[PDB]
Amino acid sequence: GIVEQCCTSICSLYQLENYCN
Amino acid sequence: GIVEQCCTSICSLYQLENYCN
Amino acid sequence: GIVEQCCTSICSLYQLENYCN
Amino acid sequence: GIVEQCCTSICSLYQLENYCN
Amino acid sequence: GIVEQCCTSICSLYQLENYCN
Amino acid sequence: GIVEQCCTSICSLYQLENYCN
Amino acid sequence: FVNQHLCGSHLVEALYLVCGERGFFY
Amino acid sequence: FVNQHLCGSHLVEALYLVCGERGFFYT
Amino acid sequence: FVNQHLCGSHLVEALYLVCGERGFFYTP
Amino acid sequence: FVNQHLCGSHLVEALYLVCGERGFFYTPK
Amino acid sequence: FVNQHLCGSHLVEALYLVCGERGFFYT
Amino acid sequence: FVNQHLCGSHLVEALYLVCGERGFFYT
Ligand SMILES: [Cl-]
Ligand SMILES: [Cl-]
Ligand SMILES: [Zn+2]
Ligand SMILES: [Zn+2]
Secondary structure, eight states: OHHHHHHHSOOOHHHHHTTBO | OHHHHHTSSOOOHHHHHTTBO | OHHHHHTSSOOOHHHHHTTBO | OHHHHHSSSOOOHHHHHTTBO | OHHHHHHHSOOOHHHHHTTBO | OHHHHHSSSOOOHHHHGGGBO | OHHHHHHHHHHHHHHHHHHGGGOEEO | OHHHHHHHHHHHHHHHHHHGGGOBEEO | OHHHHHHHHHHHHHHHHHHGGGOBOOOO | OOHHHHHHHHHHHHHHHHHGGGOBOOOOO | OHHHHHHHHHHHHHHHHHHGGGOBOOO | OHHHHHHHHHHHHHHHHHHGGGOBOOO
């Protein structure tokens, strides 16, 4: 998920927004 | 909601657990 | 102490509580 | 400034962006 | 005590230092 | 800069004040 | 209302801690 | 381990802001 | 005012995230 | 209201930074 | 070490919620 | 780059406290 994805390398705002509803 | 429950008075960690998962 | 216990592994609420006054 | 515009009514992401360089 | 003191009006860095060991 | 100075060795609030306006 | 907004930020942080592996609904 | 645990706290704050009214669910 | 102080702390955290490599500006 | 509750979280954070290695006194009662 | 420093910031915030009115020392 | 990102988040909080009415630029 997001933790594996965004804590191993940095997520952009647009990548973060993938995890919104 | 959580806001009426826990933003108008302090929720215990027991009360917050209602809102898991 | 708390750094060895909780900064190299995750402490639960209960583990953290050990450190309360 | 930002505190005056965003501390009573919520600033959205796009509004917050106005304060980037 | 401390929350009443520093959360009813802001504490300066000097006033915060009052609470250091 | 600040990252070089402060992200592997801890800066005190006192060394941080260098970076104030 | 910003007050609710700031409350919610703290609730998210508290639920992250409390809920652990279960995760939570905001 | 803890690096991911500390990073996850900042991630949920970021989702809180980014997602706005639509919200997110974490986990 | 305490509430302004606390709101600003959240605002600068939010700017740090939103503004990315550009950064932000902040003069009270 | 929960104002003081939210404030206190920031306050312990501030004491943590201000006090450095020697730590801080935090007995809220 | 900064990583320990940053973990401390999180542990103080978590102890603040967990310990409530009894407080805690973080030294 | 995630560690430097998380350090920056904490640095901004710290600068906001210590700089007070002066403010600061984090870039
Ligand atoms: Cl961190
Ligand atoms: Cl707040
Ligand atoms: Zn807050
Ligand atoms: Zn952190």
